[PDB]
């Protein structure tokens, strides 16, 4: 992992101006910009083909500030409103400079993606869910339309989703129709790609400039020269158990990144040169229960207490459950509401969890679940008293979802229903330069995507990973192509 001195490289197996490690969203975006700038670009991919986790993703891309898609669907937004939301939802300690930059450039970035051939349907999906069941292009994806954020920033949906039939998240998701037009663009520009390239070490000259990389390809060591810059774009550290334990131990035993190649190597390679890190504890957290069920009940913790409005983003429900309720949750839902939720339109019918307990009364359900007498009954009594008036003054679930819980009543056992991926990584500038602990860029070294600390510092919104990876991937390619 220690850097290799360039003087010890006897021959270069490959050479380019800009060498991009990783052919996912950040890597392809960097390749396009670098090639447009006139650089000779070579992408190094560890597997046998392009796409990475991006091709398996739902395809949300977190964009706003008044995109053509938001306008076509009748939703106002601005860069200031988007920034207000993201600072509140994606912290604490969110990078104000980076978020401001991302928001100010968002509409241009949407148009840039469309120019590369990424298609979006001018239609909005408005029901709770993890993704649009159909090929709709816009959806709420960060809890913008739920408490507390709906009182902090004006709600606007920012989940932009490429148009695709037969989306299968985890196999070939909406994220595939982000990657494919970008790959076609890169290929037409003359971007080169080498496969089975497992990048291992950075090569530096006696000034400390990064001037190439060492990799294993087809079983043997190879050295790749980078005349202008190396862009690290190899993904997260979710599958590196030692790093999870040391940095993000809330994910011990509940890994949820899309691919195994997310082993943190590029973070380590850069740390070896003195690169700085940020938010290494930050984690996306999914909650594997269908949102159409969740929104029609109340979530309670292991003490029978409500703790999150049930109409926020499911990922935020995941974080609140794992982080603050010791990963213990139950959905309390009356039989009629469960039936309505189970019949509702969803992209994830496989997440329709069946109730574990069912009873004629809340008092019986409470004793069935092993809760102390009154713990659940009181929660339901107080909820119902205010719900009869359409009001949730405790957690501010929107009134359209608020009504008394009736009988018979059921409980879904949602203990240990979370998993996630890492959000921390290398510290980078808005130009995607990797920062040394001195606060200065490391010459020749750029990075984007989930090997970096991006727009999310703590909280997460769906789309921010493909959003920041593509946005800052572009910046890394622009910067790396400079002479």
Ligand X SMILES: Cc1cc2nc3c(=O)[nH]c(=O)nc-3n(C[C@H](O)[C@H](O)[C@H](O)COP(=O)(O)OP(=O)(O)OC[C@H]3O[C@@H](n4cnc5c(N)ncnc54)[C@H](O)[C@@H]3O)c2cc1C
Integer Cα distance of 145 and 126 in angstroms: 11
The 408-427 site mask, x for binding Cl ion (CB under 5 A), equals -------------x------
Cα–Cα distances in Å, from 325 out to 305, 328, 337? 10, 6, 25
Cα–Cα distances in Å, from 333 out to 229, 267, 293, 384? 56, 44, 8, 12
Residue carrying structure tokens 């359900």 = 365
- How many residues bind ligand X (CB under 6 A)? The answer is 42
Shortest Å, Cβ 343 to ligand X: 25
Shortest Å, Cβ 39 to ligand X: 19
* CB of 466 closer than 8 Å to CB of 479: no
Query: Is residue 183 within the footprint of ligand X (CB under 6 A)?
Result: no
Shortest Å, Cβ 300 to ligand X: 26
CA proximity to 102, closest of 71, 78, 79, 68 = 79
Helical spans, DSSP H, in 131-191: 176-188
Strand residues in 80-164 grouped as ranges (E): 124-125, 138-139, 159-160
Query: Is residue 441 within the footprint of ligand X (CB under 6 A)?
Result: no
**57-96: which residues touch its own copies (CB under 8 A)?**
91-93
**380-419: which residues touch ligand X (CB under 6 A)?**
none
Q: Which residue's beta carbon is nearest to the bound ligand X?
A: 24
CA 96, 101, 104, 108 dihedral sign is: negative
Shortest Å, Cβ 445 to its own copies: 14
Query: Is residue 178 within the footprint of Cl ion (CB under 5 A)?
Result: no
User: Which CB atom, from 121 or from 306, has the smaller least distance to ligand X?
Assistant: 121
Query: Is residue 133 within the footprint of ligand X (CB under 6 A)?
Result: no
The 46-65 site mask, x for binding Cl ion (CB under 5 A), equals -------x------------
Shortest Å, Cβ 324 to its own copies: 4
| Helix, coil or strand: residue 421 | strand
How do 14-21 and 41-44 pair as beta strands? parallel
**DSSP string for 434-472:** EEBTTSSEEEEEEE-STTB--S-SSS--TTHHHHHHHHH
* CB of 418 closer than 8 Å to CB of 361: no
Query: Is residue 198 within the footprint of ligand X (CB under 6 A)?
Result: yes
Query: Is residue 214 within the footprint of its own copies (CB under 8 A)?
Result: no
* CB of 279 closer than 8 Å to CB of 93: yes
Query: Is residue 169 within the footprint of ligand X (CB under 6 A)?
Result: yes
Strand residues in 112-196 grouped as ranges (E): 124-125, 138-139, 159-160, 192-194
User: Which CB atom, from 258 or from 405, has the smaller least distance to ligand X?
Assistant: 258
467 alpha carbon, distance to own chain's centre: 8
| Helix, coil or strand: residue 100 | helix
Residue carrying structure tokens 């992992």 = 1
Shortest Å, Cβ 388 to ligand X: 38
Q: Give the binding range for Cl ion (CB under 5 A) out of 65-73, 254-262, 293-301, 361-369.
A: 254-262
User: Which CB atom, from 59 or from 318, has the smaller least distance to its own copies?
Assistant: 318
Query: Is residue 427 within the footprint of its own copies (CB under 8 A)?
Result: yes
Query: Is residue 257 within the footprint of Cl ion (CB under 5 A)?
Result: yes
- Pick what 452 binds: ligand X, its own copies, Cl ion, none; C-beta below 5 to 8 Å, kind-dependent: none
Q: How many CB atoms lie within 10 A of CB 116?
A: 18
Shortest Å, Cβ 191 to its own copies: 31
Query: Is residue 137 within the footprint of ligand X (CB under 6 A)?
Result: no
**Angle at Cα 436 formed by Cα 434 and Cα 441, nearest 5°?**
50
**379-408: which residues touch its own copies (CB under 8 A)?**
379, 381-382, 385-386, 393-395
User: Given candidates 16, 63, 82, 278, which one binds its own copies under the rule CB under 8 A?
Assistant: 278
CA 193, 194, 198, 202 dihedral sign is: negative
The 297-336 site mask, x for binding its own copies (CB under 8 A), equals ------x-xxx---------------xxx-----------
**DSSP string for 266-326:** HHHHHHTTTB-EE-TT-EEEEE-S-HHHHTTSEEE-TTS-B-S-TTS-HHHHHHIIIIIST
User: Given candidates 341, 441, 459, 463, which one binds ligand X under the rule CB under 6 A?
Assistant: 463
Determine phi and psi for 342, rounding to 5 degrees.
-70, -20
- Pick what 442 binds: its own copies, ligand X, Cl ion, none; C-beta below 5 to 8 Å, kind-dependent: none
Catalog residues that contact Cl ion under the rule CB under 5 A.
Answer: 53, 257-258, 421
Residues near its own copies (CB under 8 A): 1-2, 91-93, 208, 244-247, 249-250, 252, 268, 271-274, 276-281, 303, 305-307, 323-325, 372-375, 378-379, 381-382, 385-386, 393-395, 427, 436-438, 453, 457-458
Using CB under 6 A as the criterion, which residues of the chain lie in contact with ligand X when the complex forms? 21-27, 44-47, 52-54, 57-60, 169-170, 197-199, 233-235, 256-259, 261, 265, 421, 449-450, 462-467, 469
């Amino acid at each position: 992992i220690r850097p290799r001195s360039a003087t010890t490289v006897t021959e270069w197996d490959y050479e380019a101006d800009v060498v991009v490690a990783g052919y996912g969203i950040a890597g392809v975006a960097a390749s396009i910009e670098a090639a447009r700038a006139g650089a000779d670009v070579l992408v190094l991919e560890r597997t046998s083909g392009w796409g990475g986790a991006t091709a398996l993703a739902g395809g949300f891309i977190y964009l706003g500030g008044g995109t053509p898609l938001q306008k076509a669907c009748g939703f106002d937004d601005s860069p200031e409103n988007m920034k207000t939301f993201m600072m509140a939802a994606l912290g604490p300690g969110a990078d104000e400079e980076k978020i401001t930059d991302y928001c100010e450039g968002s509409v241009e970035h949407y148009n840039w993606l469309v120019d590369c051939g990424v298609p979006f349907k001018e239609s909005f999906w408005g029901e709770p869910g993890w993704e649009p069941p159909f090929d709709d292009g816009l959806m709420y994806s960060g809890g913008e339309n739920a408490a507390p954020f709906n009182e902090i920033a004006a709600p606007a949906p920012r989940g932009h989703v490429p148009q695709m039939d037969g989306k299968r998240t985890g196999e070939k998701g909406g994220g595939y129709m982000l990657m494919k037009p970008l790959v076609e663009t890169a290929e037409k520009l003359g971007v080169r790609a080498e496969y089975d390239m497992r990048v291992q070490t950075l090569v530096t000259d006696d000034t400390g400039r990064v001037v190439g990389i060492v990799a294993k390809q087809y079983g043997k060591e190879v050295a790749v020269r980078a005349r202008r810059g190396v862009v690290l774009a190899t993904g997260s550290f979710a599958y590196n158990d030692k790093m999870i334990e040391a940095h993000a131990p809330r994910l011990i035993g509940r890994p949820g990144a899309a691919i195994e190649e997310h082993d943190g190597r590029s973070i380590l390679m850069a740390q070896a040169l003195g690169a700085d890190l940020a938010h290494m504890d930050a984690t996306e957290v999914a909650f594997v229960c269908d949102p159409q069920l969740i929104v029609r009940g109340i979530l309670v913790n292991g003490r029978g207490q409500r703790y999150v409005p049930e109409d926020t983003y499911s990922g935020r429900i995941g974080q609140m459950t794992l982080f603050h309720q010791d990963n213990q949750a139950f959905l309390i839902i009356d039989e009629a509401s469960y039936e309505e939720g189970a019949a509702a339109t969803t992209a994830t019918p496989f997440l329709r969890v069946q109730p574990k307990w069912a009873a004629e009364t809340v008092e019986e359900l409470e004793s069935d679940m092993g809760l102390p007498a009154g713990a659940l009954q009181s929660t339901v009594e107080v909820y119902n008293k205010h719900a009869a008036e359409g009001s949730d003054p405790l957690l501010h679930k929107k009134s359209e979802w608020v009504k008394p819980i009736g009988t018979p009543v059921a409980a879904l056992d949602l203990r240990g229903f979370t998993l996630g991926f890492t959000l921390g990584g290398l510290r980078t500038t808005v130009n995607s330069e990797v920062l040394h602990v001195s606060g200065e860029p490391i010459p020749g070294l750029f990075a984007a995507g989930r090997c970096t600390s991006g727009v999310c510092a703590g909280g997460y919104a769906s789309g921010t990973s493909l959003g920041d990876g593509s946005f800052y991937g572009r910046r890394a390619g622009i910067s790396a192509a400079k002479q």
